[PDB]
Amino acid sequence: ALWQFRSMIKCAIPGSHPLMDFNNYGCYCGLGGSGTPVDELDRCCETHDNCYRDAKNLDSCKFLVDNPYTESYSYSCSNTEITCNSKNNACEAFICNCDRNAAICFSKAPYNKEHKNLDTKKYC
Amino acid sequence: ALWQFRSMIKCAIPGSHPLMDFNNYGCYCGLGGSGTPVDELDRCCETHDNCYRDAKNLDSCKFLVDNPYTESYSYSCSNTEITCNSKNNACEAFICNCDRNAAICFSKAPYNKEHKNLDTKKYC
Ligand SMILES: CCCCCCCCCCCCCCCC(=O)O
Ligand SMILES: CCCCCCCCCCCCCCCC(=O)O
Ligand SMILES: [Ca+2]
Ligand SMILES: [Ca+2]
Ligand SMILES: [Ca+2]
């Protein structure tokens, strides 16, 4: 669920304020998105939207309010490393992996502060 | 989900092997159930079935394979005390409370070993 993703982020990058650092970044970090991502980081968010979009399309998955962010799964953090629990059901595991691949990805992308709070109507 | 319930049980009663102690007990501990529970313990399990039956009937909840046992929620154990996380969604929170009320209930019921492995075709 959203709060678990925020803290996976805090797991893979210990110095971070997830909301402050990665919400309203680029074209895809923050609600919906448009155009083409502006850097690797943004690209990470676009992939994440896509991943969620995919998960909505496993016809076996019916998320509360149609939002995969409402879905809690099980995971743990140990020394910067994220592990999704295998006992997550198929839908939970999909979401869990989306979030995981995205905290890892964020952790590897260069952070460009020009790109936080982007003029999207114009650059996206 | 099932594994989380087993370990809530292990939370509220530290000496226990959940499967060995409370599966195949009475009329209601262990798959489905019939007749009238045989003691407070069994009654605890019947309530739990009912609770799950209720949760299946919140028309907003669509469990994987129709089984609320597949649904992971978030919780923690601290000194015998169980806490369901408020950030569980409405469906997750319902299940979480079913499991919680049942580990607590088991923890308070007298354990009658005559009743483990009951002849159900006959006493249930
Ligand atoms: C990757 C975006 C930021 C990461 C951590 C804080 C924001 C969460 C993820 C972005 C999704 C949009 C925010 C969710 C709020 C909502 O439920 O609409
Ligand atoms: C209260 C029953 C026992 C508690 C701990 C071990 C058994 C779990 C709960 C009983 C439900 C039946 C077992 C679930 C197995 C299944 O998925 O069919
Ligand atoms: Ca987005
Ligand atoms: Ca869940
Ligand atoms: Ca039962």
Swiss-Prot record, chains A, B:
Gene designation per UniProt = PLA2G1B
Give the regulation of activity: Regulated by bile acid salts. Up-regulated by cholate and down-regulated by taurochenodeoxycholate.
Catalytic residue positions: H48, D99
Query: What cofactor(s) does the depicted protein rely on?
Result: Ca(2+)
What are the entry keywords? Autocatalytic cleavage, Calcium, Disulfide bond, Hydrolase, Lipid metabolism, Lipoprotein, Metal-binding, Palmitate, Phospholipid metabolism, Pyrrolidone carboxylic acid, Secreted, Signal, Zymogen
Q: What is this protein called?
A: Phospholipase A2, major isoenzyme
Where does this protein reside within or beyond the cell?
Secreted
Residues lipid-modified (N6-palmitoyl lysine): K56
- Give the Enzyme Commission number: 3.1.1.4
The miscellaneous remark of the record is:
Loss of activity upon alkylation of His-48 with p-bromo phenacyl bromide; Ca(2+) and Ba(2+) protect against inactivation.
| Chain residues that bind Ca(2+) | Y28, G30, G32, D49
Q: Which family does it belong to?
A: Belongs to the phospholipase A2 family.
Q: What does the subunit section of this Swiss-Prot or TrEMBL entry state?
A: Monomer or homodimer.
User: Which transformation does this protein catalyse, written as a reaction?
Assistant: a 1,2-diacyl-sn-glycero-3-phosphocholine + H2O = a 1-acyl-sn-glycero-3-phosphocholine + a fatty acid + H(+); 1,2-ditetradecanoyl-sn-glycero-3-phosphocholine + H2O = 2-tetradecanoyl-sn-glycero-3-phosphocholine + tetradecanoate + H(+); 1,2-dihexadecanoyl-sn-glycero-3-phosphocholine + H2O = 1-hexadecanoyl-sn-glycero-3-phosphocholine + hexadecanoate + H(+); 1-hexadecanoyl-2-(9Z-octadecenoyl)-sn-glycero-3-phosphocholine + H2O = 1-hexadecanoyl-sn-glycero-3-phosphocholine + (9Z)-octadecenoate + H(+)
Question: Could you state what the record's PTM comment says about this protein?
Answer: Acylation causes dimerization.
Cofactor stoichiometry and binding? Binds 1 Ca(2+) ion per subunit.
Can you list the GO cellular component terms from the UniProt entry? Answer: cell surface; extracellular region
- What are the GO MF terms of this UniProt record? bile acid binding; calcium ion binding; calcium-dependent phospholipase A2 activity; phospholipase A2 activity; phospholipid binding; signaling receptor binding
Give the function comment from the record: Secretory calcium-dependent phospholipase A2 that primarily targets dietary phospholipids in the intestinal tract. Hydrolyzes the ester bond of the fatty acyl group attached at sn-2 position of phospholipids (phospholipase A2 activity) with preference for phosphatidylethanolamines and phosphatidylglycerols over phosphatidylcholines. May play a role in the biosynthesis of N-acyl ethanolamines that regulate energy metabolism and inflammation in the intestinal tract.
Part of the intact protein present: 23 to 146 of 146
| Disulfide-bond pairs as recorded | C11-C77, C27-C124, C29-C45, C44-C105, C51-C98, C61-C91, C84-C96
Q: Name one process (GO BP) from the record.
A: positive regulation of calcium ion transport into cytosol
Q: Which domain of life is it from?
A: Eukaryota
